[PDB]
Enzyme design. Sequence first.
Site, PDB file in Angstrom:
ATOM      1  N   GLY A 116     -35.819 -20.834  23.286  1.00 19.66           N
ATOM      2  CA  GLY A 116     -36.977 -21.087  22.550  1.00 19.66           C
ATOM      3  C   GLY A 116     -37.098 -19.868  21.557  1.00 19.66           C
ATOM      4  N   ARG A 173     -49.729 -11.680  21.631  1.00 25.09           N
ATOM      5  CA  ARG A 173     -48.487 -10.873  22.163  1.00 25.09           C
ATOM      6  C   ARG A 173     -48.607  -9.605  22.309  1.00 25.09           C
ATOM      7  NH1 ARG A 173     -43.268 -12.354  19.109  1.00 25.09           N
ATOM      8  NH2 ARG A 173     -42.508 -10.758  20.672  1.00 25.09           N
ATOM      9  N   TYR A 216     -48.983  -8.807  26.145  1.00 23.07           N
ATOM     10  CA  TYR A 216     -47.668  -8.008  26.525  1.00 23.07           C
ATOM     11  C   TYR A 216     -47.947  -6.613  25.749  1.00 23.07           C
ATOM     12  CZ  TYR A 216     -46.992 -12.972  27.831  1.00 23.07           C
ATOM     13  OH  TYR A 216     -47.035 -14.196  28.290  1.00 23.07           O
ATOM     14  N   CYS A 240     -64.594  -6.950  18.138  1.00 25.45           N
ATOM     15  CA  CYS A 240     -64.935  -6.050  18.879  1.00 25.45           C
ATOM     16  C   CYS A 240     -64.318  -5.659  20.401  1.00 25.45           C
ATOM     17  CB  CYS A 240     -66.544  -5.751  19.479  1.00 25.45           C
ATOM     18  SG  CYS A 240     -67.554  -6.206  17.833  1.00 25.45           S
ATOM     19  N   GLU A 241     -62.826  -5.445  20.187  1.00 25.92           N
ATOM     20  CA  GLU A 241     -62.243  -5.257  21.472  1.00 25.92           C
ATOM     21  C   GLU A 241     -61.368  -4.278  21.281  1.00 25.92           C
ATOM     22  OE1 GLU A 241     -63.078  -7.025  24.025  1.00 25.92           O
ATOM     23  OE2 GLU A 241     -64.106  -8.632  22.848  1.00 25.92           O
TER      24      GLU A 241
END
Lengths: 392, 411
Positions: free
Chosen positions: A252, A289, A293, A319-320
Amino acid sequence: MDYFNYQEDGQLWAEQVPLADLANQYGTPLYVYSRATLERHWHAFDKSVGDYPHLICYAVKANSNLGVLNTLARLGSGFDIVSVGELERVLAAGGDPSKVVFSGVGKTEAEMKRALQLKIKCFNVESEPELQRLNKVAGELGVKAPISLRINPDVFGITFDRAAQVYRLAHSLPNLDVHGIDCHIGLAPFIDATDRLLALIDSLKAEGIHIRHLDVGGGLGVVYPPQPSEYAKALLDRLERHRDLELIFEPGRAIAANAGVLVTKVEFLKHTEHKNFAIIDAAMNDLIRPALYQAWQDIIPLRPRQGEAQTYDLVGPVCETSDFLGKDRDLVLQEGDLLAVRSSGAYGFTMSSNYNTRPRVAEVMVDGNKTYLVRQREELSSLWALESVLPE
Amino acid sequence: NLYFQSNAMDYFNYQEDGQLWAEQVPLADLANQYGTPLYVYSRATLERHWHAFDKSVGDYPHLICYAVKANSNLGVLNTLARLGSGFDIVSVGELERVLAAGGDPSKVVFSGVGKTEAEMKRALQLKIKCFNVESEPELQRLNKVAGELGVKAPISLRINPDVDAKTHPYISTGLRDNKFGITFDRAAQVYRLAHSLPNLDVHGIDCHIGSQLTALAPFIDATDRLLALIDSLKAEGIHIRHLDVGGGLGVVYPQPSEYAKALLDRLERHRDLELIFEPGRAIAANAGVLVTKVEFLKHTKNFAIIDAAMNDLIRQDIIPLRPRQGEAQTYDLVGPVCETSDFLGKDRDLVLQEGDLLAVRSSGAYGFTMSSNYNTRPRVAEVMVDGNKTYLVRQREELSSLWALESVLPE
Ligand SMILES: [Cl-]
């Protein structure tokens, strides 16, 4: 390694198309895929196996865009799918169902039925209850379902010590045909598990249970006249006597990762006492990602500037705290500058959401000096078109 | 039924028939009618929590600006708009959602570190309450857009709280070097800049004073300093009318937290500052459950393979719609995605049979809002219960629509 390279004019190009041109034409953020990169990687895998019977089953979840799938389908690729949606994408992209294998721990009766009707290559079964369900459904349809069991190396499948028993169960179930064994062996344990696996194929053979193919999964494994990895080399050498076991590989990331970039624009530059931040227009909903992760993806300028570099954390526009693409990157930036995030062809758009009611971005494919839109940017109002207020 | 059951957090509770009900609607009926997985929201739960928050401040002039990103479903937003709620949005899409839900734009504040010129233009056209500006470059962009439209943009600056470095060195270093806002020592300077720009109109200050894990004493001194800044700015001709304290300053179940009370004690002397709160999870989290079906019970460790995956809920108590009599066994609840992170719960004691339906509590916030189509899985339906009435508030996505915007290579 891929076709995203700087050219004589000092800017970054995808094959023979400037990335800056694509940003201008289709807006940012933007995913850009290289047809030549996908083809070069697929052939490296296809040709590394030699004359040994095999099938490359591209892991659709990595990047399932119809343009990407169509590219591989034209090469005669197989596909590993994990849902009925992915099977339908493969068919829409011109893929051959006889080259499809169906993986996943939670397959529904509905999904199994559609796959049986399409006569796919094999169901990669992960549990006994799933085996029972596939037998029930195949009986209802009056057909025989081709199966393979997902086995785990002796150290999410079935353990080696219960494998023989579960294979004997498949053999006794009236609506199933035992066709393969699926073992995701992807160095000493790899080889050790390969032997135990081949020994299992032999013992089952003595009992009238004939395994015709071995699926080794992904995580491999091409060394570049491209050659297989030491892992693959170790397997091929042990399969001369063991024939005609068709070998199935499920690359993949190995095919798609470097075939894509995410182009993003620097909105604002901000400076604190000890840090520098470049606020970009790509958010966690576009590429998850790094946030989900702990993936490290190279971030480079479409047009590198001269001068002293500063260290920046690249942060998204909402806003994170987890809204970032990279940390501690030394770059020479001005506001409005465009950047490319490498290795965004796999597990990029596939995981994109509409979080913060942000429309998903466009996906474009380059092919020499031609550009094809392969996914249109979502129209904003479509995000809530299926919703309703209360009637009260 | 005088003995209708409830709990302190929500209206998802068991009744006389041995099953889990969403207000006066059996969850099992909804699963049967709309399929699984399914998000089910409770109107009464949203209202209960919104009111608890709104009433906590008492008589003091305030606005609750619900954090739309927690759950922006039109039905959820409409429930709150009907109560007169305000909204905190972080994108033009969230602004359009509020408008479509019957919300009042004059009660909308726009937050976010990367607002585009296009978003600012639309927000200005709809005349939102205020732009919560996070950096000087953004302040310049808003001035540019307002300048092009020939209007005055209402602004509040996001100012980091003034933590004392001597007593809280680590928190101080953390704050000063974070990506959000402007440091307290630079506040007056950036406010003077805003004051000098005629296409900006200074209305507020956005200082999330309770968001740093701190004791009451330091919080109060920091608050006092924020208030003194507001006063020094006022004397200097820069008039701040509202203070937005962000999220977290919740309620203790129904009086306000001691933090909230200390703040109110100081604001109530003058009472010339409108107080804005931005709760999200505190309003929406318990108003929702995710209903999922057990596909397979795989024994090795025990795994209950369920039909809800990471693409449906990526973040919680998990209970049966119809509890079985027996000796509970321990299971990990894992979804159908071929990912190691595709799970909803670890080590849960339940009495299960294949086909059983389960409810994942606290799924009304950061549940559906983060849902994706990973593995080409259509997004689920969202339903709202209101007493014994059921409202479909988001239809399940049709599978083929997932690739409707895509195309193959030329032939
Ligand atoms: Cl700044």
